[PDB]
Design a binder for this molecule. Structure first.
Ligand SMILES: C#CCNC(=O)[C@@H](Cc1ccccc1)NC(=O)C[C@H](O)[C@H](Cc1ccccc1)NC(=O)[C@@H](NC(=O)c1ccccn1)C(C)C
Lengths: 99, 99
């Protein structure tokens, strides 16, 4: 799709057998989702850095469907005010900024 | 331009007679720049909302050139870790997300 930016670019995703919504965020390096039970291995990771850090669980090579595009990438699971698809997964789906 | 997202989408801008760099951030509603002297009227605005708010100066209808595209939009001037071009100015330059 071509998504204009008059509203927040919120898309539907499928992850961990769940349907969720997330924001396509070119300002975010990483993808951070709340409340997903993913199977397989993880390691803790500190993100943010303003006011302290936030600890999340880093799962590598997670299958995720974004707006119908099935890809694989690192998903950080932990507290976040909004589910965010970061550049790491936008590259996988071939998403570009165009003007 | 078509901008892939393997690196941070940092672009050159011209604002208030100065060259600056800023991040194209589809996760940001508003454009927030640090250290620009803009002429004409402003009003204070509270932004963020996590840990407290940050106060910035809101300047409406500011001429700004972004990656060579001359547009007009609201620019918030105040503290920010990164100069950010938000959706408000990405709409003006006709920037879309495409995949
Ligand atoms: C007004 C305003 C700017 N941002 C906001 O209010 C936040 C709130 C939010 C947090 C998580 C998910 C969705 C939304 N929204 C964003 O989309 C974040 C923004 O796209 C990006 C993503 C990011 C996060 C951490 C470090 C570096 C970059 N930017 C930022 O968050 C900004 N800097 C930060 O230091 C920061 C750190 C931790 C939380 C919030 N902010 C700077 C770039 C100015």
């Amino acid at each position: 799709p071509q998504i204009t930016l008059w509203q927040r670019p919120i898309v539907t995703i499928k992850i961990g057998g769940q349907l969720k919504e997330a924001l396509l965020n070119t300002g975010a390096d990483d993808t951070v989702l709340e409340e997903v039970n993913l199977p397989g291995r993880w390691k803790p990771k500190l993100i943010g850095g303003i006011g302290g850090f936030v600890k999340v669980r880093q799962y590598d090579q997670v299958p995720i469907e974004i707006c119908g595009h099935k890809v694989i990438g690192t998903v950080l699971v932990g507290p976040t005010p909004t589910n965010v698809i970061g550049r790491n997964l936008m590259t996988q789906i071939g998403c570009t900024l165009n003007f």
